[PDB]
Amino acid sequence: STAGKVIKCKAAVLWEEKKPFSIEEVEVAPPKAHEVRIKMVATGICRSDDHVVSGTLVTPLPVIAGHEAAGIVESIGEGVTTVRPGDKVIPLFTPQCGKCRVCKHPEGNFCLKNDLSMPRGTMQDGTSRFTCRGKPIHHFLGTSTFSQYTVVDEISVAKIDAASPLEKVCLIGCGFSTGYGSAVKVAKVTQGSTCAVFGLGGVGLSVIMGCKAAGAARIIGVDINKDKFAKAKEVGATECVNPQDYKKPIQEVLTEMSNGGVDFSFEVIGRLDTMVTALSCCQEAYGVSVIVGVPPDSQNLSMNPMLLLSGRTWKGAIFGGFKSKDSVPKLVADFMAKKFALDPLITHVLPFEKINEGFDLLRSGESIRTILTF
Amino acid sequence: STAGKVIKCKAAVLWEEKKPFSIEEVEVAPPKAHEVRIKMVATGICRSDDHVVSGTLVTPLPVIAGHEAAGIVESIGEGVTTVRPGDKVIPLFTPQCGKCRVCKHPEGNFCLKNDLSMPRGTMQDGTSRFTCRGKPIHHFLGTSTFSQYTVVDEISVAKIDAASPLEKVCLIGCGFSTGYGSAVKVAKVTQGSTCAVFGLGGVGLSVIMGCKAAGAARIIGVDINKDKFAKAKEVGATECVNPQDYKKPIQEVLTEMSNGGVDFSFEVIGRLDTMVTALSCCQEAYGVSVIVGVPPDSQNLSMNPMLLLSGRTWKGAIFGGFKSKDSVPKLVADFMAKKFALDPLITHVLPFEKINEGFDLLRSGESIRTILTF
Ligand SMILES: NC(=O)c1ccc[n+]([C@@H]2O[C@H](COP(=O)([O-])OP(=O)(O)OC[C@H]3O[C@@H](n4cnc5c(N)ncnc54)[C@H](O)[C@@H]3O)[C@@H](O)[C@H]2O)c1
Numbered sequence: 055s056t057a058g059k060v061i062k063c064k065a066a067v068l069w070e071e072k073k074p075f076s077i078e079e080v081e082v083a084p085p086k087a088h089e090v091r092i093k094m095v096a097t098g099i100c101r102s103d104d105h106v107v108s109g110t111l112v113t114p115l116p117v118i119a120g121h122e123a124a125g126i127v128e129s130i131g132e133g134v135t136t137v138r139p140g141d142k143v144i145p146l147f148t149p150q151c152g153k154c155r156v157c158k159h160p161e162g163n164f165c166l167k168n169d170l171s172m173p174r175g176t177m178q179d180g181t182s183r184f185t186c187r188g189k190p191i192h193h194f195l196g197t198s199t200f201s202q203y204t205v206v207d208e209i210s211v212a213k214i215d216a217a218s219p220l221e222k223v224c225l226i227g228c229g230f231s232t233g234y235g236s237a238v239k240v241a242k243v244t245q246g247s248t249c250a251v252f253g254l255g256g257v258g259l260s261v262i263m264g265c266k267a268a269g270a271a272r273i274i275g276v277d278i279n280k281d282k283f284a285k286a287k288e289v290g291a292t293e294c295v296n297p298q299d300y301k302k303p304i305q306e307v308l309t310e311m312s313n314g315g316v317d318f319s320f321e322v323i324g325r326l327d328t329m330v331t332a333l334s335c336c337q338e339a340y341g342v343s344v345i346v347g348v349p350p351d352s353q354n355l356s357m358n359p360m361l362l363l364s365g366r367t368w369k370g371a372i373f374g375g376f377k378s379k380d381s382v383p384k385l386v387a388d389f390m391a392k393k394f395a396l397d398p399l400i401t402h403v404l405p406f407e408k409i410n411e412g413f414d415l416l417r418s419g420e421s422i423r424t425i426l427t428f
Numbered sequence: 429s430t431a432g433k434v435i436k437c438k439a440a441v442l443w444e445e446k447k448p449f450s451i452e453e454v455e456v457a458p459p460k461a462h463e464v465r466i467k468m469v470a471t472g473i474c475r476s477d478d479h480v481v482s483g484t485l486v487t488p489l490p491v492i493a494g495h496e497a498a499g500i501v502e503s504i505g506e507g508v509t510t511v512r513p514g515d516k517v518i519p520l521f522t523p524q525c526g527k528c529r530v531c532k533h534p535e536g537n538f539c540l541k542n543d544l545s546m547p548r549g550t551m552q553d554g555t556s557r558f559t560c561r562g563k564p565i566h567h568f569l570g571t572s573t574f575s576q577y578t579v580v581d582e583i584s585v586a587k588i589d590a591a592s593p594l595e596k597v598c599l600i601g602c603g604f605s606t607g608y609g610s611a612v613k614v615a616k617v618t619q620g621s622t623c624a625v626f627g628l629g630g631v632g633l634s635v636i637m638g639c640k641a642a643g644a645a646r647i648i649g650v651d652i653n654k655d656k657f658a659k660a661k662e663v664g665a666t667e668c669v670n671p672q673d674y675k676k677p678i679q680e681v682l683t684e685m686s687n688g689g690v691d692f693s694f695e696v697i698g699r700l701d702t703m704v705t706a707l708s709c710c711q712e713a714y715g716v717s718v719i720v721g722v723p724p725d726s727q728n729l730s731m732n733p734m735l736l737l738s739g740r741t742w743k744g745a746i747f748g749g750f751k752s753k754d755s756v757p758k759l760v761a762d763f764m765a766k767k768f769a770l771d772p773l774i775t776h777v778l779p780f781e782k783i784n785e786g787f788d789l790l791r792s793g794e795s796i797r798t799i800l801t802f
């Protein structure tokens with residue numbers, strides 16, 4: 055029993071940008087009040103973790119990154135009432151404090167206690183629970199799951215069903231719920247509709263799964279990597295287009311194909327240009343475009359405001375619009391009742407120590423999701 | 429008497445950008461199949477008409493502009509069924525052809541037969557019905573109401589009540605319905621909300637009548653002309669701020685004032701920087717911003733897509749989201765039943781011949797709406 059005491063264990067520390075993760079011994083403090091220490095069982099490699107390596111997503115370094123994961127409470131700090139040692143849990147990179155403006159609003163889910171808008175890389179009380187080489191290491195979006203153990207605030211953890219398969223439902227902590235909710239909760243794809251999805255990585259395939267669940271009649275997947283097409287058609291794409299095959303720009307190609315513009319489009323890559331392309335190819339009078347991708351830090355896009363004046367709606371969302379502590383238990387329960395599949399998304403399962411190999415698979419385009427098991 | 433013959437009459441022609449309108453004698457050809465010729469009774473001076481003079485809104489010159497008006501039908505062409513001679517009608521700058529994808533869709537109103545996206549300045553059949561010294565004069569948005577008689581396509585005209593005061597209700601052809609529908613139909617302002625309205629001209633004051641009636645609790649009017657403030661508080665603003673009074677930028681003042689951002693904002697000026705300011709001052713997780721102003725031709729705004737990823741919605745709309753032929757008779761019928769006051773928007777009534785004086789009152793900050801009588 056490790057309770058009440060510091061744990062020494064391995065974590066993958068990123069000491070500086072554009073470097074490999076370094077697997078090292080770190081010391082993890084015991085939880086303080088309202089904090090929970092979690093033994094990690096599986097964590098997915100998401101493209102936003104790679105944005106930290108490339109410097110596109112700015113957060114204080116050195117850092118233990120990792121935010122899509124599932125584990126078991128090893129101990130709870132003073133005052134924790136929503137989880138108990140031995141519970142299976144999913145860390146929440148968007149917290150739900152339940153007490154702010156946004157948590158109390160019926161539609162908002164970007165809680166004001168998040169660490170994404172102006173990242174401090176600490177716990178809610180402003181300190182770190184990690185030491186590595188005598189130095190405190192930063193947390194990432196209050197989750198830090200590339201570690202055998204991590205400590206999170208109570209507003210950042212959800213108890214899930216005790217029979218969940220943790221090496222599959224860790225995708226509900228990020229990729230799958232982000233994609234699925236952008237379609238069914240943020241865009242509100244309607245039955246009969248034509249949808250176009252830019253990007254067919256794990257979030258993008260999850261956006262197709264949500265569009266097909268909302269009853270879209272046509273779901274076009276767009277990617278420059280044609281090897282992604284078979285899995286996209288497998289989860290619901292009625293057709294796939296690769297922009298490099300055409301001589302016209304893809305917004306004209308899609309407008310011609312949809313006879314005037316799609317009803318819903320989704321940018322699920324993170325590029326300033328495909329974000330304006332995705333808005334453009336939706337129908338000018340009633341089209342809805344949803345930005346899901348994370349843009350390079352401090353870069354502005356350029357667009358003509360007449361694209362909106364005619365009637366288009368442009369929205370973005372974090373974590374598919376779901377209030378995270380309410381929604382994740384319920385999405386795991388739906389997965390258990392076979393309402394949606396997560397297995398098409400998992401292409402590689404590697405032990406934690408091959409983290410750097412899992413990232414190279416993401417960078418070379420060969421994986422959708424790699425799950426790392428501890 | 430005139431039916432079947434060319435009418436020779438007075439019309440305000442704009443021959444060149446940045447010049448006064450020229451009161452000319454023009455020949456108005458009679459209506460071809462499915463066109464209606466109208467004798468004008470009251471027409472308002474809207475900023476979009478001034479945008480043509482400015483070169484802000486490109487449309488083929490020479491032109492008879494004018495788009496906010498009401499008249500009596502003088503003669504119908506072969507096949508008109510929705511109006512007869514003697515009917516009071518309001519011409520529609522956004523048509524409603526009934527047959528396209530947008531007109532069939534329940535929520536879009538920007539009919540594909542519009543002449544606003546790439547102005548042709550002709551009747552639907554690609555020709556002009558107006559000549560002046562043997563030269564064709566172009567139509568403007570299929571309405572051209574700065575003339576004693578005009579010819580419009582049947583998809584661009586709505587028969588209204590027989591008892592309607594035509595000199596109040598010409599406002600429902602543009603300014604009022606546009607601002608009102610923007611708040612109640614496009615933003616769908618909620619009871620208890622805080623609204624911020626940038627621009628307090630005729631259309632902005634109608635956006636404040638729409639917010640107040642949707643039950644908004646707080647309505648912050650923003651204008652650089654402090655003289656517009658008293659009529660904004662009379663139709664409903666709770667407060668008005670002037671950007672030039674502050675040392676810090678108006679998105680910061682507004683965020684500070686509304687305790688983290690407003691619920692709904694509207695840009696009703698037509699500038700690229702206030703379009704981005706109005707998006708920024710609305711709440712980052714669940715704020716809605718609606719662009720109503722017409723931007724300058726071919727200019728692009730620059731904005732940080734993180735404004736949208738946190739949860740904001742940005743949308744624009746023409747004519748306040750109203751399907752024109754269906755909504756303009758009901759708004760008139762509702763004006764009739766005292767459901768809204770039109771009178772605070774009319775500050776000047778002048779005879780048509782004093783058109784150029786009515787534009788210098790608009791350009792000077794002195795009027796909201798000047799109505800020109802025939
Ligand atoms: N909004 C959220 O809450 C949230 C959550 C998770 C992930 N994200 C972001 O979503 C985006 C997608 O994440 P992912 O894990 O699915 O990434 P991924 O790398 O697996 O998917 C990207 C897909 O985009 C394709 N792509 C790249 N350039 C393209 C282009 N020019 N045109 C068309 N297709 C292109 C790639 O080939 C790839 O298949 C990332 O930016 C990630 O940071 C946001």
Ligand SMILES: NC(=O)c1ccc[n+]([C@@H]2O[C@H](COP(=O)([O-])OP(=O)(O)OC[C@H]3O[C@@H](n4cnc5c(N)ncnc54)[C@H](O)[C@@H]3O)[C@@H](O)[C@H]2O)c1
Pocket residue numbers: 474475476479602603606626627628629630631632650651652653656671696697698699702719720721722723745746747748793796
């Ligand atoms: N979307 C539509 O269908 C549609 C229809 C009609 C009008 N419009 C557009 O709406 C706009 C307003 O029309 P209107 O008739 O109400 O115009 P208006 O000129 O009467 O009002 C513009 C108001 O904005 C104010 N203003 C200008 N610059 C400002 C700034 N920098 N910051 C704050 N306030 C400032 C002016 O002082 C004025 O009160 C125009 O762009 C017009 O083209 C659009």
Ligand SMILES: [Cu+2]
Pocket residue numbers: 100101102103121122228229
């Ligand atoms: Cu992620």
Ligand SMILES: [Cu+2]
Pocket residue numbers: 474475476477495496602603
């Ligand atoms: Cu107008």
Ligand SMILES: [Zn+2]
Pocket residue numbers: 149150151152153154155156157158165166167
């Ligand atoms: Zn909160």
Ligand SMILES: [Zn+2]
Pocket residue numbers: 523524525526527528529530531532539540541
């Ligand atoms: Zn139509």
